Protein backbone atom coordinates (compact mmCIF):
# COMPACT_ATOMS: atom_id res chain seq x y z
CA UNK A 1 0.00 0.00 0.00
CA UNK A 2 0.98 3.62 -0.63
CA UNK A 3 0.69 6.57 1.75
CA UNK A 4 -0.20 8.83 -1.18
CA UNK A 5 -3.60 7.63 -2.38
CA UNK A 6 -4.70 7.57 1.25
CA UNK A 7 -3.03 10.59 2.90
CA UNK A 8 -1.16 13.80 2.11
CA UNK A 9 2.54 13.38 1.31
CA UNK A 10 4.95 16.34 1.42
CA UNK A 11 8.39 15.34 0.03
CA UNK A 12 8.39 12.12 2.04
CA UNK A 13 11.15 9.60 1.21
CA UNK A 14 10.51 6.23 -0.41
CA UNK A 15 11.30 4.56 2.94
CA UNK A 16 8.12 5.99 4.50
CA UNK A 17 6.22 6.12 1.21
CA UNK A 18 6.33 2.31 1.25
CA UNK A 19 5.94 1.29 4.92
CA UNK A 20 6.00 -2.39 3.85
CA UNK A 21 9.82 -2.32 3.62
CA UNK A 22 10.01 -2.44 7.43
CA UNK A 23 10.89 -5.94 8.66
CA UNK A 24 11.71 -7.24 12.12
CA UNK A 25 8.74 -5.46 13.75
CA UNK A 26 6.99 -8.69 14.69
CA UNK A 27 9.21 -11.09 16.70
CA UNK A 28 6.30 -13.34 17.62
CA UNK A 29 6.81 -15.08 20.99
CA UNK A 30 6.28 -18.68 22.07
CA UNK A 31 2.96 -20.01 23.49
CA UNK A 32 1.00 -16.86 24.29
CA UNK A 33 1.72 -16.67 28.04
CA UNK A 34 5.11 -15.61 29.49
CA UNK A 35 4.41 -12.22 27.92
CA UNK A 36 6.39 -9.74 30.03
CA UNK A 37 5.34 -6.13 29.52
CA UNK A 38 8.91 -4.95 28.84
CA UNK A 39 8.97 -6.64 25.41
CA UNK A 40 5.79 -4.77 24.47
CA UNK A 41 7.90 -2.02 22.92
CA UNK A 42 8.57 -4.35 19.97
CA UNK A 43 4.85 -4.26 19.18
CA UNK A 44 2.79 -3.77 15.98
CA UNK A 45 4.69 -2.47 12.94
CA UNK A 46 4.44 1.03 11.50
CA UNK A 47 1.92 1.04 8.67
CA UNK A 48 0.32 3.44 6.18
CA UNK A 49 -1.38 5.22 9.12
CA UNK A 50 1.17 5.50 11.95
CA UNK A 51 3.87 6.90 9.66
CA UNK A 52 5.25 10.46 9.39
CA UNK A 53 3.75 12.49 6.55
CA UNK A 54 6.57 15.06 6.55
CA UNK A 55 10.34 14.57 6.84
CA UNK A 56 12.04 17.92 7.54
CA UNK A 57 15.59 16.71 8.11
CA UNK A 58 18.55 18.98 7.44
CA UNK A 59 21.28 17.82 5.08
CA UNK A 60 24.88 18.68 5.98
CA UNK A 61 26.82 17.44 2.93
CA UNK A 62 28.03 20.93 1.93
CA UNK A 63 28.84 21.98 5.49
CA UNK A 64 30.62 18.70 6.27
CA UNK A 65 32.63 18.89 3.03
CA UNK A 66 33.81 22.42 3.81
CA UNK A 67 34.40 21.61 7.48
CA UNK A 68 36.70 18.68 6.74
CA UNK A 69 38.84 20.78 4.39
CA UNK A 70 38.94 23.92 6.54
CA UNK A 71 37.99 27.59 6.45
CA UNK A 72 39.70 30.17 4.28
CA UNK A 73 43.00 31.69 5.43
CA UNK A 74 44.70 34.82 4.11
CA UNK A 75 47.63 33.21 2.31
CA UNK A 76 49.24 35.25 -0.44
CA UNK A 77 51.69 37.96 -1.42
CA UNK A 78 50.37 41.36 -2.49
Amino acid sequence: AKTSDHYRTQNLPHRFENPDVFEGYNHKPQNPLYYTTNMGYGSIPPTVDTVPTCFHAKTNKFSEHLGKCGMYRNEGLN
Binding site: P13, H14, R15, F16, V21, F22, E23, G24, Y25, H27, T36, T37, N38, M39, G40, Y41, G42, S43, I44, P45, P46, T47, D49, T50, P52, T53, C54, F55, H56, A57, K58, T59, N60, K61, E64, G67
Partner: protein, 437 residues
Protein backbone atom coordinates in the same frame (compact mmCIF):
# COMPACT_ATOMS: atom_id res chain seq x y z
CA UNK B 1 28.12 16.51 13.64
CA UNK B 2 25.68 17.25 16.47
CA UNK B 3 25.79 14.04 18.50
CA UNK B 4 24.54 13.01 21.95
CA UNK B 5 25.62 9.92 23.88
CA UNK B 6 22.82 8.57 26.08
CA UNK B 7 23.65 6.64 29.26
CA UNK B 8 20.79 4.65 30.77
CA UNK B 9 21.52 3.62 34.36
CA UNK B 10 19.29 1.35 36.42
CA UNK B 11 16.19 -0.68 35.65
CA UNK B 12 14.26 2.55 35.14
CA UNK B 13 17.08 3.71 32.89
CA UNK B 14 16.93 0.55 30.78
CA UNK B 15 13.13 0.70 30.44
CA UNK B 16 13.31 4.41 29.53
CA UNK B 17 15.99 3.46 27.02
CA UNK B 18 13.79 0.78 25.46
CA UNK B 19 10.78 3.07 25.12
CA UNK B 20 12.90 5.98 23.85
CA UNK B 21 15.04 4.06 21.35
CA UNK B 22 11.83 2.52 20.02
CA UNK B 23 10.57 6.05 19.37
CA UNK B 24 13.92 7.13 17.91
CA UNK B 25 14.12 4.19 15.49
CA UNK B 26 10.45 4.56 14.53
CA UNK B 27 10.92 8.31 13.98
CA UNK B 28 14.03 7.91 11.83
CA UNK B 29 12.57 4.93 9.97
CA UNK B 30 15.09 2.37 11.22
CA UNK B 31 13.81 -1.16 11.72
CA UNK B 32 14.88 -2.88 14.99
CA UNK B 33 17.55 -4.87 13.14
CA UNK B 34 19.45 -1.58 12.93
CA UNK B 35 19.29 -1.86 9.14
CA UNK B 36 18.45 1.19 7.09
CA UNK B 37 15.74 0.34 4.51
CA UNK B 38 15.86 0.72 0.73
CA UNK B 39 17.02 4.25 -0.09
CA UNK B 40 16.55 3.92 -3.90
CA UNK B 41 20.23 3.23 -4.66
CA UNK B 42 21.60 6.72 -3.96
CA UNK B 43 21.35 7.47 -0.25
CA UNK B 44 20.17 11.02 -0.85
CA UNK B 45 20.19 14.00 1.46
CA UNK B 46 19.33 12.78 4.96
CA UNK B 47 21.45 13.03 8.10
CA UNK B 48 18.91 13.35 10.93
CA UNK B 49 19.97 9.92 12.18
CA UNK B 50 23.50 11.15 12.99
CA UNK B 51 22.56 12.57 16.40
CA UNK B 52 21.71 9.08 17.73
CA UNK B 53 23.08 6.47 15.29
CA UNK B 54 26.28 6.06 13.29
CA UNK B 55 26.82 4.94 9.70
CA UNK B 56 29.04 1.90 10.01
CA UNK B 57 30.71 0.26 7.02
CA UNK B 58 27.57 -1.68 6.08
CA UNK B 59 24.60 0.70 6.08
CA UNK B 60 23.52 -0.39 9.57
CA UNK B 61 22.76 1.82 12.59
CA UNK B 62 24.39 1.23 15.97
CA UNK B 63 22.95 3.65 18.55
CA UNK B 64 25.00 5.93 20.81
CA UNK B 65 23.68 4.40 24.02
CA UNK B 66 25.22 2.71 27.05
CA UNK B 67 22.73 0.54 28.95
CA UNK B 68 24.12 -0.17 32.43
CA UNK B 69 22.33 -2.15 35.12
CA UNK B 70 24.04 -4.28 37.77
CA UNK B 71 21.18 -6.80 37.89
CA UNK B 72 21.43 -8.95 34.72
CA UNK B 73 17.70 -9.39 34.09
CA UNK B 74 16.22 -6.23 32.55
CA UNK B 75 19.21 -5.83 30.21
CA UNK B 76 19.40 -9.55 29.37
CA UNK B 77 15.75 -9.23 28.35
CA UNK B 78 16.82 -6.49 25.92
CA UNK B 79 19.61 -8.77 24.68
CA UNK B 80 16.97 -11.44 24.01
CA UNK B 81 14.29 -9.00 22.82
CA UNK B 82 13.15 -7.52 19.53
CA UNK B 83 15.94 -4.90 19.58
CA UNK B 84 18.71 -7.48 20.01
CA UNK B 85 20.29 -6.59 16.65
CA UNK B 86 20.30 -2.82 17.26
CA UNK B 87 22.81 -2.31 20.07
CA UNK B 88 26.48 -3.22 19.93
CA UNK B 89 27.20 -6.28 22.14
CA UNK B 90 29.72 -4.37 24.29
CA UNK B 91 27.22 -1.60 25.01
CA UNK B 92 24.60 -3.33 27.20
CA UNK B 93 26.99 -3.54 30.14
CA UNK B 94 25.84 -5.60 33.12
CA UNK B 95 27.25 -6.97 36.36
CA UNK B 96 26.55 -10.13 38.33
CA UNK B 97 25.26 -8.80 41.68
CA UNK B 98 22.67 -6.20 42.67
CA UNK B 99 22.91 -2.89 44.50
CA UNK B 100 19.47 -3.35 46.12
CA UNK B 101 18.14 0.18 46.83
CA UNK B 102 21.40 1.02 48.61
CA UNK B 103 23.43 4.12 47.74
CA UNK B 104 26.42 2.82 49.70
CA UNK B 105 26.24 -0.51 47.87
CA UNK B 106 25.99 1.25 44.53
CA UNK B 107 28.87 3.64 45.28
CA UNK B 108 31.54 1.93 47.45
CA UNK B 109 31.04 -1.74 46.37
CA UNK B 110 30.07 -3.85 43.30
CA UNK B 111 29.01 -0.75 41.37
CA UNK B 112 32.64 0.42 41.63
CA UNK B 113 34.20 -2.49 39.71
CA UNK B 114 32.11 -1.77 36.59
CA UNK B 115 32.56 2.02 36.26
CA UNK B 116 35.93 1.49 34.54
CA UNK B 117 34.31 -0.60 31.80
CA UNK B 118 31.45 1.90 31.49
CA UNK B 119 33.97 4.74 31.13
CA UNK B 120 35.92 2.73 28.54
CA UNK B 121 32.78 2.28 26.43
CA UNK B 122 31.97 5.99 26.89
CA UNK B 123 35.54 6.82 25.80
CA UNK B 124 35.19 4.67 22.67
CA UNK B 125 31.87 6.33 21.81
CA UNK B 126 33.36 9.80 22.31
CA UNK B 127 36.39 8.88 20.18
CA UNK B 128 34.14 7.73 17.32
CA UNK B 129 32.06 10.87 17.99
CA UNK B 130 32.98 13.96 15.99
CA UNK B 131 31.19 16.71 17.91
CA UNK B 132 29.88 15.82 21.37
CA UNK B 133 27.13 18.27 22.28
CA UNK B 134 26.37 16.59 25.60
CA UNK B 135 25.82 13.40 27.55
CA UNK B 136 22.21 12.46 28.31
CA UNK B 137 21.85 10.33 31.45
CA UNK B 138 18.55 8.64 32.38
CA UNK B 139 18.13 7.20 35.87
CA UNK B 140 15.86 7.07 38.93
CA UNK B 141 16.19 8.22 42.53
CA UNK B 142 14.63 4.97 43.75
CA UNK B 143 18.01 3.76 44.96
CA UNK B 144 20.92 1.40 44.38
CA UNK B 145 22.07 1.48 40.76
CA UNK B 146 20.07 4.57 39.85
CA UNK B 147 21.56 6.69 42.65
CA UNK B 148 24.96 5.42 43.78
CA UNK B 149 26.34 4.24 40.45
CA UNK B 150 24.75 7.20 38.67
CA UNK B 151 26.45 9.56 41.13
CA UNK B 152 29.82 7.84 40.67
CA UNK B 153 29.39 7.88 36.88
CA UNK B 154 28.54 11.59 36.85
CA UNK B 155 31.58 12.34 39.03
CA UNK B 156 33.88 10.37 36.71
CA UNK B 157 32.55 12.02 33.54
CA UNK B 158 32.97 15.36 35.31
CA UNK B 159 36.60 14.68 36.23
CA UNK B 160 37.61 13.25 32.82
CA UNK B 161 35.47 15.11 30.27
CA UNK B 162 34.27 18.35 31.85
CA UNK B 163 32.97 21.31 29.82
CA UNK B 164 30.50 19.28 27.74
CA UNK B 165 26.93 19.28 28.98
CA UNK B 166 25.37 16.50 31.09
CA UNK B 167 21.58 16.52 30.95
CA UNK B 168 19.88 14.35 33.57
CA UNK B 169 16.43 12.76 33.47
CA UNK B 170 15.77 11.59 37.02
CA UNK B 171 12.67 9.70 38.10
CA UNK B 172 11.54 11.38 41.31
CA UNK B 173 9.56 9.72 44.13
CA UNK B 174 6.02 10.90 44.77
CA UNK B 175 4.62 12.57 47.92
CA UNK B 176 2.50 9.50 48.68
CA UNK B 177 2.96 6.67 46.16
CA UNK B 178 6.30 4.91 46.56
CA UNK B 179 7.72 1.49 45.80
CA UNK B 180 10.89 1.23 47.89
CA UNK B 181 11.25 2.08 51.58
CA UNK B 182 14.71 3.72 51.81
CA UNK B 183 13.85 6.05 48.92
CA UNK B 184 14.20 9.25 51.07
CA UNK B 185 17.69 8.11 52.13
CA UNK B 186 18.70 7.27 48.56
CA UNK B 187 17.27 10.54 47.24
CA UNK B 188 18.84 12.73 49.94
CA UNK B 189 22.24 11.09 49.42
CA UNK B 190 22.25 11.62 45.64
CA UNK B 191 21.44 15.36 45.67
CA UNK B 192 24.90 16.00 47.16
CA UNK B 193 26.41 14.46 44.02
CA UNK B 194 23.96 15.55 41.31
CA UNK B 195 24.26 19.18 42.42
CA UNK B 196 27.83 20.04 41.39
CA UNK B 197 28.12 17.62 38.45
CA UNK B 198 24.93 18.31 36.47
CA UNK B 199 24.04 21.07 34.04
CA UNK B 200 20.31 20.28 33.84
CA UNK B 201 18.44 17.97 36.20
CA UNK B 202 14.98 17.31 34.70
CA UNK B 203 12.68 15.62 37.20
CA UNK B 204 9.82 13.21 36.48
CA UNK B 205 7.40 11.95 39.13
CA UNK B 206 5.38 8.78 38.59
CA UNK B 207 2.23 9.92 40.42
CA UNK B 208 1.88 12.96 38.16
CA UNK B 209 2.09 10.66 35.14
CA UNK B 210 -0.51 8.37 36.71
CA UNK B 211 -2.91 11.28 37.27
CA UNK B 212 -2.24 12.56 33.73
CA UNK B 213 -2.95 9.14 32.21
CA UNK B 214 -6.09 8.68 34.31
CA UNK B 215 -7.41 12.18 33.54
CA UNK B 216 -6.45 13.10 29.95
CA UNK B 217 -5.96 9.69 28.31
CA UNK B 218 -9.02 7.73 29.60
CA UNK B 219 -6.91 4.78 30.70
CA UNK B 220 -7.92 3.52 34.13
CA UNK B 221 -4.93 1.14 34.41
CA UNK B 222 -1.66 2.86 33.43
CA UNK B 223 1.78 1.29 33.77
CA UNK B 224 5.48 1.69 32.96
CA UNK B 225 4.82 1.32 29.22
CA UNK B 226 2.72 4.49 29.13
CA UNK B 227 5.02 6.21 31.65
CA UNK B 228 8.16 5.63 29.61
CA UNK B 229 6.41 6.50 26.33
CA UNK B 230 5.46 9.89 27.79
CA UNK B 231 9.03 10.43 29.03
CA UNK B 232 10.32 9.33 25.61
CA UNK B 233 8.07 11.91 23.95
CA UNK B 234 9.48 14.54 26.34
CA UNK B 235 13.10 13.73 25.52
CA UNK B 236 12.38 13.37 21.78
CA UNK B 237 10.69 16.78 21.68
CA UNK B 238 13.67 18.18 23.60
CA UNK B 239 16.27 16.75 21.22
CA UNK B 240 14.36 17.03 17.91
CA UNK B 241 15.78 20.49 17.14
CA UNK B 242 19.15 18.87 16.42
CA UNK B 243 18.04 16.13 14.04
CA UNK B 244 15.12 17.90 12.34
CA UNK B 245 15.42 21.47 11.09
CA UNK B 246 13.25 24.33 12.23
CA UNK B 247 12.79 28.05 12.28
CA UNK B 248 14.29 29.40 15.53
CA UNK B 249 16.43 26.34 16.26
CA UNK B 250 17.09 25.94 19.99
CA UNK B 251 19.92 23.50 20.60
CA UNK B 252 21.31 22.06 23.82
CA UNK B 253 23.65 24.92 24.76
CA UNK B 254 20.98 27.52 23.97
CA UNK B 255 18.26 26.15 26.21
CA UNK B 256 20.91 25.30 28.78
CA UNK B 257 21.98 28.95 29.02
CA UNK B 258 18.53 30.55 28.58
CA UNK B 259 16.98 28.44 31.34
CA UNK B 260 19.31 28.67 34.35
CA UNK B 261 19.90 32.09 35.97
CA UNK B 262 22.45 30.89 38.54
CA UNK B 263 24.63 27.70 38.82
CA UNK B 264 22.48 26.28 41.62
CA UNK B 265 18.99 26.49 40.02
CA UNK B 266 19.49 23.89 37.28
CA UNK B 267 16.49 21.67 38.12
CA UNK B 268 13.84 22.40 35.47
CA UNK B 269 10.30 21.03 35.23
CA UNK B 270 9.07 19.37 32.05
CA UNK B 271 5.52 19.44 30.70
CA UNK B 272 4.07 17.90 27.54
CA UNK B 273 0.96 19.28 25.87
CA UNK B 274 -1.16 17.81 24.37
CA UNK B 275 -1.12 14.59 26.35
CA UNK B 276 -4.72 14.01 25.20
CA UNK B 277 -6.13 10.74 23.84
CA UNK B 278 -7.48 10.28 20.31
CA UNK B 279 -11.19 9.95 21.12
CA UNK B 280 -11.04 13.25 22.99
CA UNK B 281 -8.66 14.92 20.51
CA UNK B 282 -11.27 14.37 17.81
CA UNK B 283 -13.23 17.22 19.43
CA UNK B 284 -10.68 20.06 19.68
CA UNK B 285 -8.89 22.44 17.34
CA UNK B 286 -5.57 21.76 19.13
CA UNK B 287 -4.60 25.33 18.27
CA UNK B 288 -1.37 26.91 19.47
CA UNK B 289 -3.25 29.11 21.95
CA UNK B 290 -5.09 26.06 23.31
CA UNK B 291 -1.99 23.86 23.65
CA UNK B 292 -0.17 26.71 25.39
CA UNK B 293 -3.03 27.52 27.77
CA UNK B 294 -3.33 23.82 28.65
CA UNK B 295 0.36 23.68 29.54
CA UNK B 296 0.74 26.01 32.55
CA UNK B 297 -2.08 24.23 34.39
CA UNK B 298 -1.28 22.58 37.74
CA UNK B 299 -3.26 19.54 36.54
CA UNK B 300 -0.76 18.87 33.71
CA UNK B 301 2.48 19.15 35.68
CA UNK B 302 5.03 16.34 35.59
CA UNK B 303 6.36 16.44 39.17
CA UNK B 304 3.19 16.65 41.35
CA UNK B 305 4.12 20.23 42.20
CA UNK B 306 1.64 23.06 41.69
CA UNK B 307 3.51 26.15 40.38
CA UNK B 308 1.00 28.52 42.02
CA UNK B 309 3.08 28.33 45.22
CA UNK B 310 6.06 29.94 43.52
CA UNK B 311 7.35 32.07 40.68
CA UNK B 312 8.54 31.20 37.18
CA UNK B 313 12.19 32.21 36.80
CA UNK B 314 12.64 30.95 33.23
CA UNK B 315 10.53 29.13 30.65
CA UNK B 316 11.65 27.40 27.47
CA UNK B 317 8.93 26.17 25.10
CA UNK B 318 9.78 23.77 22.27
CA UNK B 319 6.95 23.72 19.74
CA UNK B 320 6.98 20.67 17.49
CA UNK B 321 4.63 20.49 14.52
CA UNK B 322 2.64 22.91 12.35
CA UNK B 323 2.86 26.00 14.56
CA UNK B 324 3.12 29.63 13.47
CA UNK B 325 5.25 32.25 15.28
CA UNK B 326 2.34 34.73 15.23
CA UNK B 327 0.24 32.29 17.27
CA UNK B 328 3.24 31.49 19.48
CA UNK B 329 3.73 35.19 20.25
CA UNK B 330 0.00 35.75 20.80
CA UNK B 331 -0.03 32.80 23.21
CA UNK B 332 3.01 34.18 25.07
CA UNK B 333 1.33 37.60 25.31
CA UNK B 334 -1.89 36.09 26.69
CA UNK B 335 0.07 33.98 29.19
CA UNK B 336 1.91 37.10 30.38
CA UNK B 337 -1.32 39.10 30.70
CA UNK B 338 -2.98 36.35 32.75
CA UNK B 339 -2.56 36.98 36.47
CA UNK B 340 -2.29 33.49 38.00
CA UNK B 341 1.05 32.82 36.28
CA UNK B 342 3.36 34.91 38.47
CA UNK B 343 6.71 35.53 36.82
CA UNK B 344 9.61 36.63 38.98
CA UNK B 345 10.37 40.35 39.17
CA UNK B 346 13.95 40.20 37.86
CA UNK B 347 12.96 38.43 34.61
CA UNK B 348 10.38 40.31 32.53
CA UNK B 349 11.38 38.55 29.29
CA UNK B 350 11.67 34.91 30.26
CA UNK B 351 10.38 32.85 27.33
CA UNK B 352 12.60 30.99 24.86
CA UNK B 353 10.50 29.57 22.03
CA UNK B 354 11.77 27.02 19.54
CA UNK B 355 9.85 25.95 16.43
CA UNK B 356 10.31 22.62 14.66
CA UNK B 357 8.35 21.80 11.50
CA UNK B 358 8.32 18.05 12.17
CA UNK B 359 5.13 16.83 13.88
CA UNK B 360 5.51 14.30 16.71
CA UNK B 361 5.87 10.82 15.25
CA UNK B 362 3.14 8.58 16.65
CA UNK B 363 4.12 5.11 17.84
CA UNK B 364 1.51 2.50 16.81
CA UNK B 365 -0.03 0.79 19.82
CA UNK B 366 0.57 3.79 22.08
CA UNK B 367 -2.08 5.58 24.09
CA UNK B 368 -1.22 9.16 23.09
CA UNK B 369 -3.14 11.09 20.47
CA UNK B 370 -1.64 11.56 17.03
CA UNK B 371 -1.74 15.26 16.26
CA UNK B 372 0.17 17.83 14.20
CA UNK B 373 1.13 20.19 17.07
CA UNK B 374 2.85 19.75 20.43
CA UNK B 375 4.71 21.76 23.08
CA UNK B 376 7.45 20.59 25.43
CA UNK B 377 7.60 23.30 28.11
CA UNK B 378 10.57 23.43 30.49
CA UNK B 379 9.80 25.76 33.38
CA UNK B 380 12.21 26.75 36.14
CA UNK B 381 9.65 27.54 38.82
CA UNK B 382 10.50 28.18 42.48
CA UNK B 383 7.70 25.83 43.59
CA UNK B 384 10.06 22.83 43.18
CA UNK B 385 11.16 23.25 46.82
CA UNK B 386 7.87 21.65 47.96
CA UNK B 387 9.04 18.16 46.99
CA UNK B 388 12.32 18.80 48.76
CA UNK B 389 10.54 20.03 51.89
CA UNK B 390 8.58 16.76 51.99
CA UNK B 391 11.86 14.93 51.33
CA UNK B 392 13.45 16.67 54.32
CA UNK B 393 10.41 15.83 56.46
CA UNK B 394 10.63 12.13 55.58
CA UNK B 395 14.42 12.10 55.97
CA UNK B 396 14.22 13.76 59.39
CA UNK B 397 11.55 11.43 60.73
CA UNK B 398 13.51 8.40 59.54
CA UNK B 399 16.93 9.67 60.71
CA UNK B 400 15.64 10.74 64.14
CA UNK B 401 16.15 7.18 65.45
CA UNK B 402 18.65 5.79 62.91
CA UNK B 403 16.36 3.46 60.97
CA UNK B 404 17.84 1.46 58.06
CA UNK B 405 21.30 3.00 58.55
CA UNK B 406 23.27 -0.15 59.45
CA UNK B 407 23.26 -1.41 55.84
CA UNK B 408 24.72 1.91 54.69
CA UNK B 409 27.36 2.07 57.42
CA UNK B 410 28.33 -1.53 56.66
CA UNK B 411 28.64 -0.92 52.91
CA UNK B 412 30.14 2.59 53.16
CA UNK B 413 28.48 5.75 54.48
CA UNK B 414 30.39 7.26 57.36
CA UNK B 415 27.61 8.55 59.59
CA UNK B 416 28.28 12.24 58.88
CA UNK B 417 27.37 11.78 55.20
CA UNK B 418 23.61 11.79 55.85
CA UNK B 419 23.93 15.00 57.88
CA UNK B 420 26.15 16.54 55.19
CA UNK B 421 23.59 15.79 52.46
CA UNK B 422 20.79 17.14 54.68
CA UNK B 423 22.75 20.35 55.30
CA UNK B 424 23.54 20.76 51.60
CA UNK B 425 19.93 20.31 50.49
CA UNK B 426 18.66 22.62 53.27
CA UNK B 427 21.12 25.32 52.18
CA UNK B 428 20.05 24.68 48.59
CA UNK B 429 16.34 25.16 49.27
CA UNK B 430 17.34 28.26 51.24
CA UNK B 431 19.01 29.45 48.02
CA UNK B 432 15.83 28.59 46.10
CA UNK B 433 13.55 30.63 48.34
CA UNK B 434 16.17 33.40 48.30
CA UNK B 435 15.97 33.63 44.52
CA UNK B 436 12.20 33.23 44.78
CA UNK B 437 11.70 36.27 47.02
Amino acid sequence: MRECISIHVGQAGVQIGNACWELYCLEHGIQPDGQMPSDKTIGGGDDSFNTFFSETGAGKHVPRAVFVDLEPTVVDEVRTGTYRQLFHPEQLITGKEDAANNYARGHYTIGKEIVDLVLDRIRKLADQCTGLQGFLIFHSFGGGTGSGFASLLMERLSVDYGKKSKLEFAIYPAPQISTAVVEPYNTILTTHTTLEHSDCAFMVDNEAIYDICRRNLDIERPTYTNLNRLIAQIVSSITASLRFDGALNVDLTEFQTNLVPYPRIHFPLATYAPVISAEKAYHEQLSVAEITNACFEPANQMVKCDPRHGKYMACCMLYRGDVVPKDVNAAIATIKTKRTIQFVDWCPTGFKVGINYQPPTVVPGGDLAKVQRAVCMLSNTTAIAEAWARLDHKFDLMYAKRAFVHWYVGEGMEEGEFSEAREDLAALEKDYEEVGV
